[PDB]
Amino acid sequence: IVEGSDAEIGMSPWQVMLFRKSPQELLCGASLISDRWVLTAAHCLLYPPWDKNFTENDLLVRIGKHSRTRYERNIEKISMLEKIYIHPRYNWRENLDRDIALMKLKKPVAFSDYIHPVCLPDRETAASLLQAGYKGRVTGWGNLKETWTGQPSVLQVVNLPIVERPVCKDSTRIRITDNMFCAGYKPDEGKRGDACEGDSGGPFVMKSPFNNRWYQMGIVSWGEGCDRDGKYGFYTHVFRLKKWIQKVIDQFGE
């Protein structure tokens, strides 16, 4: 997260960390959508170009965390992955279209003041909130700035506005699809901020002024550099892929 700030305790209870067992490594962000399911970005699990193809037993998830690495009492929990479900049409060869994946936990996680699921948008919620100018919130333990040569101690958070599709399209040569949307401040809007490498899989949430609930409208997917004027972070369009999310959960839930 670039130009964000330290999150407050319990501010993002649905936040999940995706870790690689060996060698030990914090791979991506993710989100809790139920006591058994976690949402993340497909490329975090499968991305052939970088020779990445993880299986259930290569990873673990940590939930309820605030401080990246300073163990947290009877707060944080660890869970094993029973099964990984990557969207069958996830396009890793070209533009990361449908950059989404679900992970079923071996055992259900217990909710607490620090662990609580986020809501998935419904037809009306998406119609009301998915509008240019409307701000969402992004969270993660990823790079604090574009790096080509550091990472946060505590979860970072930043609020960014959704940007008009025409502007998103003209901002990059990469072909974009309706399965993604972009967010961030424009060059002269003053404010800054953006997600960055390591933040993928993390949620882009919005608080409904209609029912006071937090909804995950997107998943940190990609970008070109981090927080560069003229560029905008791209996110997987959760509502557009909700049909698939529900199918997986119903077919393989229990």
Partner: peptide
């Protein structure tokens, strides 16, 4: 679940986080 999106330490105890109002103000055209 029917309890999704309501944070135990915030919405659940009628408390606002430091920046959520920024989001609300952005939802007003």
């Amino acid at each position: 679940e029917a309890d999704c999106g309501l944070r135990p330490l915030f919405e659940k105890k009628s408390l606002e986080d430091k920046t959520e109002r920024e989001l609300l103000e952005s939802y007003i055209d």
